[PDB]
Write a protein that binds this ligand. Structure first.
Ligand SMILES: [Zn+2]
Length: 237
């Protein structure tokens, strides 16, 4: 994990400089979460994901959400597929074979991440809770075969490490922030989409899941910079 120090030095590198050049309130950061039906044949059977864009100043700008109904159930994994569908409110495989547009989806993602007026071939990170890293890297990898494309394009980084570093760099007073990284995971553990809102919960929604993550970090990070937590932007409504 000598390369997970790299992830750590990467996350610091981004954050320190953007506060160092006094632009951190407006920089755009990206969070991702996924739902998996099951984990079939070495790969995760992805059923939903959301990538959402926020800045400290404006809060959540928007998000990119899709529900994925694979054509079919892997053989050997019916119970497993039914369980996740069950947990996550996902529909079962094969509905008109309104099939996974994976060639397209990498490209919608790649369009979503791309920075206005950047002069390098480099996409922002997406940050997710530590548990969801294997799933979300796998998803990314699955798509890169349907286009011969590469993993390396993407950095799939841990959100707690982000919260920790962002807050502690914008902290000023000693009373502010997290002494240990633990507190961040712990705070993101402390605290939708139309279908799920139609399914009452709308609690296992990756749009939901991902949005509650950002609200707590905005919650602790915004006032350190004197930013009103506007509802429907930093707060709900
Ligand atoms: Zn949803």
């Amino acid at each position: 994990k000598n390369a997970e120090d790299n992830e750590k030095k990467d996350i610091q590198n981004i954050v320190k400089l953007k506060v160092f050049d006094q632009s951190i309130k407006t920089e755009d950061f990206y969070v991702i979460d996924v739902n998996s039906y099951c984990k079939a044949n070495g790969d995760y059977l992805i059923g939903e994901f959301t990538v959402t864009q926020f800045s400290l100043q404006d809060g959540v700008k928007n998000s990119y959400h899709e529900t994925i109904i694979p054509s079919c159930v892997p053989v050997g994994y019916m119970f497993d597929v039914k369980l996740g569908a069950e947990e996550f409110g996902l529909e079962m495989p094969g509905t008109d074979d309104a099939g996974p547009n994976y060639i397209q989806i990498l490209a919608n993602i790649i369009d979503y991440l791309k920075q206005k007026d950047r002069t390098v071939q480099v996409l922002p990170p997406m940050f997710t809770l530590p548990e969801k890293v294997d799933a979300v890297q796998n998803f990314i990898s699955q798509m890169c075969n349907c286009a011969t494309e590469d993993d390396s394009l993407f950095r799939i980084y841990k959100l707690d490490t982000f919260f920790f570093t962002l807050i502690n760099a914008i902290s000023s007073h000693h009373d502010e922030g997290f002494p240990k990284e633990s507190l961040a995971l712990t705070q993101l553990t402390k605290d939708a989409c139309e279908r799920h809102e139609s399914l009452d919960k709308s609690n296992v929604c990756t749009t939901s899941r991902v949005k509650r993550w950002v609200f707590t970090i905005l919650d602790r990070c915004c006032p350190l910079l004197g930013i009103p937590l506007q509802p429907g932007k930093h707060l709900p409504f």
